Tab-separated table of C-alpha atoms and ligand atoms in Angstrom:
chain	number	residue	atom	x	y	z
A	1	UNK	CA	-42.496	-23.539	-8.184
A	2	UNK	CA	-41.116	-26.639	-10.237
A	3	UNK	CA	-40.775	-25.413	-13.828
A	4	UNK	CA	-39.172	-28.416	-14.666
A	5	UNK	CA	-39.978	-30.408	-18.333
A	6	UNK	CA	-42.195	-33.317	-17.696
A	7	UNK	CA	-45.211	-35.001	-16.611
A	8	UNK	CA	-47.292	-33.553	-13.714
A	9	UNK	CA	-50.499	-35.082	-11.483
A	10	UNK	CA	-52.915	-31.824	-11.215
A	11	UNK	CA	-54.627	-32.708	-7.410
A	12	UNK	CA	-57.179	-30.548	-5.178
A	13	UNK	CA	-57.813	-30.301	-1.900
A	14	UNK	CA	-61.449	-29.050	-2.355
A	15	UNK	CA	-62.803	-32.669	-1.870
A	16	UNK	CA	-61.984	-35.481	1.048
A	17	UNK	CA	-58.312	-35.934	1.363
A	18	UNK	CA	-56.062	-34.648	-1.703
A	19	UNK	CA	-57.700	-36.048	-5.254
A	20	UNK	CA	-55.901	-36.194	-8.215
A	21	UNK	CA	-58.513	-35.012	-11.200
A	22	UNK	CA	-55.975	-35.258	-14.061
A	23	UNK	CA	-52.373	-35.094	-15.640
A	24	UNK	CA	-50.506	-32.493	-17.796
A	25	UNK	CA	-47.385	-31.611	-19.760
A	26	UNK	CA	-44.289	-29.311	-18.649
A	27	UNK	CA	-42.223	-28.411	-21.976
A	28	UNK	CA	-40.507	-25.099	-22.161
A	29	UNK	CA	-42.000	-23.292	-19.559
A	30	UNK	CA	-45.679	-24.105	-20.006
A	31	UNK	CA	-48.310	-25.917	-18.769
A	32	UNK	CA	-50.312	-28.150	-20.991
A	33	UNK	CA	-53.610	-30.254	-19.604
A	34	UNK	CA	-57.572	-31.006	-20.944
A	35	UNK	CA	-59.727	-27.810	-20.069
A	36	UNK	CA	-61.862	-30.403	-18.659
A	37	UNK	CA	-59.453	-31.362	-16.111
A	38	UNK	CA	-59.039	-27.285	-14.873
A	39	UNK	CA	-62.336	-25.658	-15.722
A	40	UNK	CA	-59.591	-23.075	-16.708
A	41	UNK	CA	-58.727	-22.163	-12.921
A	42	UNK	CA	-55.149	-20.920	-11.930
A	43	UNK	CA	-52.872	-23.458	-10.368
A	44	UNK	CA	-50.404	-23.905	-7.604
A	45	UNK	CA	-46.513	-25.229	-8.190
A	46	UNK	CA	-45.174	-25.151	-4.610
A	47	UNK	CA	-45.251	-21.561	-3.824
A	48	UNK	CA	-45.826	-20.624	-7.261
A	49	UNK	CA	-48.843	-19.642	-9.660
A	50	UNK	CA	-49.856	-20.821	-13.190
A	51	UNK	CA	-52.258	-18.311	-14.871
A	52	UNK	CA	-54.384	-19.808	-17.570
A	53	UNK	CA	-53.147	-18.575	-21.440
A	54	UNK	CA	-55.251	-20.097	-23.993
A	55	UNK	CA	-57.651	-22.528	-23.997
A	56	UNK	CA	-60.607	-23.751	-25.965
A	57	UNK	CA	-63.712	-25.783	-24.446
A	58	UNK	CA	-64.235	-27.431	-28.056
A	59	UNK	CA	-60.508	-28.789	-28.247
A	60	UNK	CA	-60.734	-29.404	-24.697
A	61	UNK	CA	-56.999	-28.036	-24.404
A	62	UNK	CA	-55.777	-25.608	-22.040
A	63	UNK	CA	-52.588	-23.747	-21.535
A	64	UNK	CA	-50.659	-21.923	-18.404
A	65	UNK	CA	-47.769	-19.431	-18.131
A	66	UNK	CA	-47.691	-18.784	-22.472
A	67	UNK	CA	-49.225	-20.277	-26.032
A	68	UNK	CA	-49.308	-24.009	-26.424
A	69	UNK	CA	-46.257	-25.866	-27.397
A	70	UNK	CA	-47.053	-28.964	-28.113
A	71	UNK	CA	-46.774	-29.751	-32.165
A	72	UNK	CA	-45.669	-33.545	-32.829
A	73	UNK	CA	-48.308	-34.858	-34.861
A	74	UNK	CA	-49.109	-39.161	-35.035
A	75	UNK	CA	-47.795	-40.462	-38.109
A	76	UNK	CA	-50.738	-42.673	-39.196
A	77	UNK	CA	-49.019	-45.870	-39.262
A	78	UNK	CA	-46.842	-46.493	-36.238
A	79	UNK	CA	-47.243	-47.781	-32.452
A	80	UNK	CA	-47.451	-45.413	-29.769
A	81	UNK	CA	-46.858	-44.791	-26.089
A	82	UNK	CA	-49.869	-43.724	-23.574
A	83	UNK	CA	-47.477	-42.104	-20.439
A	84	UNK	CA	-49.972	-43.060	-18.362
A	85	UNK	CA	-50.082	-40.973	-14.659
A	86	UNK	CA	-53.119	-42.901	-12.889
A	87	UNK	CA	-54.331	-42.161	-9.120
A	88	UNK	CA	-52.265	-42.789	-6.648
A	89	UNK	CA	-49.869	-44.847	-8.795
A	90	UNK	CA	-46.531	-45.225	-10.536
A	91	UNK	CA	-45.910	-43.503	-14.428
A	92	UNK	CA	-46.399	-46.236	-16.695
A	93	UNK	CA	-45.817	-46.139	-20.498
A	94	UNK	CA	-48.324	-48.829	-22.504
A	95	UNK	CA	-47.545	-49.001	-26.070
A	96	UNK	CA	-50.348	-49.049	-28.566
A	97	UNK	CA	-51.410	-49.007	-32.515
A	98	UNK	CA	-54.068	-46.245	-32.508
A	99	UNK	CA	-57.493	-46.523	-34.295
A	100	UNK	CA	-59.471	-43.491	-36.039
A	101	UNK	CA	-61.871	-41.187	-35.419
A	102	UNK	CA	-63.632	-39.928	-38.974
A	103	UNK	CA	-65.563	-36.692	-38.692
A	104	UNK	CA	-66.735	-34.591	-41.314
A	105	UNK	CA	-63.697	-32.293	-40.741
A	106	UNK	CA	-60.773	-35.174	-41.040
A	107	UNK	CA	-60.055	-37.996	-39.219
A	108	UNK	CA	-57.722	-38.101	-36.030
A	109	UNK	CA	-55.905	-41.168	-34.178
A	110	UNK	CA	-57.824	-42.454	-31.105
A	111	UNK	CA	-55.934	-44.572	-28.623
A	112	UNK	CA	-58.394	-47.657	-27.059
A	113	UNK	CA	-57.037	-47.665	-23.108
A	114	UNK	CA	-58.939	-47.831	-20.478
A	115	UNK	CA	-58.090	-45.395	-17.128
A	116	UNK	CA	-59.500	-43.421	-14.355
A	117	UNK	CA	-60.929	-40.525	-14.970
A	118	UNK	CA	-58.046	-38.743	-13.187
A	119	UNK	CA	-56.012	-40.150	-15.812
A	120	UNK	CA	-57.042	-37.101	-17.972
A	121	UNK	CA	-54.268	-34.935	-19.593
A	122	UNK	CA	-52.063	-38.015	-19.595
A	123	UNK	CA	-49.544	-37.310	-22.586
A	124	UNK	CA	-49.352	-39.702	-25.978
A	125	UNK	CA	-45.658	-39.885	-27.461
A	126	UNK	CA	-44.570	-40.943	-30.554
A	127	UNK	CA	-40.795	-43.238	-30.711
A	128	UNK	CA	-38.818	-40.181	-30.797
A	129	UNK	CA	-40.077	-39.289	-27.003
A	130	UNK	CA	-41.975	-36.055	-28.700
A	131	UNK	CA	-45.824	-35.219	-27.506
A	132	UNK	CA	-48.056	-35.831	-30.146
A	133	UNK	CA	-51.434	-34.992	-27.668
A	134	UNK	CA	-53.054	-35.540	-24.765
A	135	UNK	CA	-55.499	-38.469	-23.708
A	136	UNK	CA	-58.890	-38.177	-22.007
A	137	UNK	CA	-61.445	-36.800	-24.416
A	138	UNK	CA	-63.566	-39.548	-25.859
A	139	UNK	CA	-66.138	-42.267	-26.765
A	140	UNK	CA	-68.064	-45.251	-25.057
A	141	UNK	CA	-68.428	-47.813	-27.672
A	142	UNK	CA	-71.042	-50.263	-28.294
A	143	UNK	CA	-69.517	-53.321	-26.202
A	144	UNK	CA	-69.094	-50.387	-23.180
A	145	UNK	CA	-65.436	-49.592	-24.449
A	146	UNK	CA	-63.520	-46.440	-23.616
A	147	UNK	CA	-61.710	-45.559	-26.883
A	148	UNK	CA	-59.685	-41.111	-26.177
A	149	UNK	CA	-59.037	-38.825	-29.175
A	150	UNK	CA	-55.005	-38.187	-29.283
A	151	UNK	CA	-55.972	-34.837	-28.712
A	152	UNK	CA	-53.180	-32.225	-30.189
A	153	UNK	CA	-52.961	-28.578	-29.764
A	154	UNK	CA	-51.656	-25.659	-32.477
A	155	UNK	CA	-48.486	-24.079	-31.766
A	156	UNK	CA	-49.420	-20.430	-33.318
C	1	UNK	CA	-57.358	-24.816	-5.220
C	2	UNK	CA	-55.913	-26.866	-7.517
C	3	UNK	CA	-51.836	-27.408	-7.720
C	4	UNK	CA	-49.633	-29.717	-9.638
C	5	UNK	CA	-46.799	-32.297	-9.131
C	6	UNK	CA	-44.057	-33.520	-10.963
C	7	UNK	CA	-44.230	-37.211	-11.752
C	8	UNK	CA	-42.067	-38.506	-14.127
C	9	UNK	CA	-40.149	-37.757	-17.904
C	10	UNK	CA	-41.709	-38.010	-21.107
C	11	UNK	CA	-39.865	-40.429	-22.936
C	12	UNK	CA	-40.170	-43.536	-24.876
C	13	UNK	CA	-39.885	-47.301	-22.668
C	14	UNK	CA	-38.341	-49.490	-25.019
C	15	UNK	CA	-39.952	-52.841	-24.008
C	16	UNK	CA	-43.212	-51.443	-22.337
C	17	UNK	CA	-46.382	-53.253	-21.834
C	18	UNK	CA	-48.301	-53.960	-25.493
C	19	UNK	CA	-51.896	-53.752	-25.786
C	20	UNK	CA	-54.821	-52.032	-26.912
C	21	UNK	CA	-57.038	-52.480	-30.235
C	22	UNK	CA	-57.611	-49.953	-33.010
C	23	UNK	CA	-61.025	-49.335	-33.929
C	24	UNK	CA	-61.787	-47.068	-36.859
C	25	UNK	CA	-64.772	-45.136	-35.961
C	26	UNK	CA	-67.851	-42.330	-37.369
C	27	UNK	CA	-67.742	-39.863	-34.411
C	28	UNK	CA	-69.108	-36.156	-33.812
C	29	UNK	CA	-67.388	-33.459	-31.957
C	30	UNK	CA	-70.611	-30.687	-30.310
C	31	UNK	CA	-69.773	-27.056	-29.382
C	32	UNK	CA	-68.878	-28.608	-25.633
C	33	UNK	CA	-66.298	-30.327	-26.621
C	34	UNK	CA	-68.044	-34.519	-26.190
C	35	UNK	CA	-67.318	-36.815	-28.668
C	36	UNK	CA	-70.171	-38.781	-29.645
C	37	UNK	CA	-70.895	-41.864	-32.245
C	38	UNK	CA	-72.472	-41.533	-35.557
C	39	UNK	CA	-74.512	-44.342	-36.497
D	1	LIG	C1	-63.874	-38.918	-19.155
D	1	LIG	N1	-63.004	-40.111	-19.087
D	1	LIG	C2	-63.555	-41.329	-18.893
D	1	LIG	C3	-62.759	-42.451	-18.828
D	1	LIG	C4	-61.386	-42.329	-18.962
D	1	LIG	C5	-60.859	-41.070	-19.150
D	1	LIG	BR1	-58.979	-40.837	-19.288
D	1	LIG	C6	-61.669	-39.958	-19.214
């Protein structure tokens, strides 16, 4: 199938019509998405299959055809670009300043956007054009808010 | 079955749409993987 770099919709057919249930990233031949978004089946790329790798229901990260990739890290001061892939519509970029999320194990950006759930998986860039994580894992905050971790992967 | 579809490159719009706040918040991450908030 298309091993091509880039953003990719991840659709079914198991429900009516063909239903896009999230996003992912093509860089250097593997496939990076939310292990929400998969459930950690295999995929199809044209006549092609994408065996799962790794992934980890905690990190909600999964990744097809070999190890995860994806290492650009947010910078903690600087803007942002959600490369937003919604239902049914056009790749948009929407640039952002994140926010924080403090645990007790360190604190990580959190981007405040508001998409469709099928919006999952949708990749967060920094001005360079490099990944930094994926959006889709997140909060509801008190005035009903959507606020997504910029969730990152390690490249072992 | 579930099968993918290219749709677009990953690379920075100069000039895209600005928006968005940045809230600074206490969260908790469970075993599942759901973010919750710690009040
Ligand atoms: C689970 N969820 C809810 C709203 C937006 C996104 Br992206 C993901």
């Amino acid at each position: 199938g298309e091993t091509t770099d880039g953003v990719y919709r991840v659709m079914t057919r198991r429900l009516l019509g063909s239903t896009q249930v999230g996003v992912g990233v093509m860089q250097e031949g593997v496939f990076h998405t939310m292990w929400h978004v998969t459930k950690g089946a295999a995929l199809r790329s044209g006549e092609g299959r994408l065996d799962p790798y790794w992934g980890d229901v905690k990190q909600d990260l999964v990744s097809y055809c070999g190890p995860w990739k994806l290492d650009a890290a947010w910078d903690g001061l600087s803007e942002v670009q959600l490369l937003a892939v919604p239902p049914g519509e056009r790749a948009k970029n929407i640039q952002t300043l994140p926010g924080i999320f403090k645990t007790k194990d360190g604190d990580i950006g959190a981007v405040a956007l508001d998409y469709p759930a099928g919006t999952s998986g949708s990749p967060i860039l920094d001005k360079c054009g490099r990944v930094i994580g994926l959006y889709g894992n997140g909060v509801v905050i008190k005035n009903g808010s959507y606020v997504s971790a910029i969730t990152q992967g390690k490249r072992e | 079955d579930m099968y993918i579809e290219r749709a677009g490159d990953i690379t920075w719009e100069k000039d895209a749409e600005v928006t968005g706040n940045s809230p600074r918040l206490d969260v908790a991450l469970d075993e599942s993987g759901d973010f919750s908030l710690v009040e």
